Amino acid sequence: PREIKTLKEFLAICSRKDARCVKVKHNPSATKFKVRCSRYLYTLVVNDKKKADKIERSIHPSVKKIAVTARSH
Amino acid sequence: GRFKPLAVKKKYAKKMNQNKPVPYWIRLRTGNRIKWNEKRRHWRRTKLNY
Amino acid sequence: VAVRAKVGSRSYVRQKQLAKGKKVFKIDCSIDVLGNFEQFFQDNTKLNGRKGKLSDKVRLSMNDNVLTISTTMAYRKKYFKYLTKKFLKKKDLRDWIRILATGKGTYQLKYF
């Protein structure tokens, strides 16, 4: 697992040919974008919802977006 | 325990396959003398020692 | 530990108090016997190691089948569940009624 510090780097990673999916995780005070990629899972943390909305909207349509939930037990 | 060579394992497997009773229709054959197996082996009576 | 204790000092045990605060607990008895309950607490809620004689430190009120305790001393929330079970033990209701925590500072009565 690796951290991404910048939106530019997160976009560059999300646009790689091996980014299988991005899981979006909502936390009480932060949002986490996790990109599956090939060897590593990359995480970008945002502490602002106003920015999180724009990030969730700026997605390419080649990669799939998944809302992380507690699945059926 | 866990360890044994494959050849030893195969010998034990053959003995396991042999340890069986006579099928019933064999006793109905013309001129038959077999009644019981007479070579049955029980693990707690006679040892193979492979 | 720093000071050796004395047997004679067991006649006065004093609770800690809230520095700049006031805690509130509530029991929801919404589900005839609304009396014998507030006064039960009044004369059986121990304070400073002495039953009854509730001064200004602890206060009670029974509103709309809900009983509230407001204090400025340190009490465990378990203490009032312990008193509730002591109460329900006398009237012989323990086989039907039970008490469960429903939120921070809040107990509630329920059926088995």
């Binding site: - | 494959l6 497997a13 396991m16 396959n17 | -």
Partner: protein, 47 residues
């Protein structure tokens, strides 16, 4: 075993696990690549 699966039935195996039984025979658990249905392959085989 993977190559034989491809030859005998038009299926692709992603995983083969094997064991040798206490009676001496070898048994294989074969997982298909989820683009094929093991139930439909079983129906075609006849089991």
């Amino acid at each position: 075993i993977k190559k034989a699966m491809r030859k005998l039935y038009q299926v692709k195996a992603v995983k083969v696990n094997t064991l040798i039984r206490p009676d001496g025979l070898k048994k294989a658990y074969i997982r298909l690549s989820a683009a094929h249905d093991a139930l439909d392959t079983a129906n075609k085989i006849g089991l």
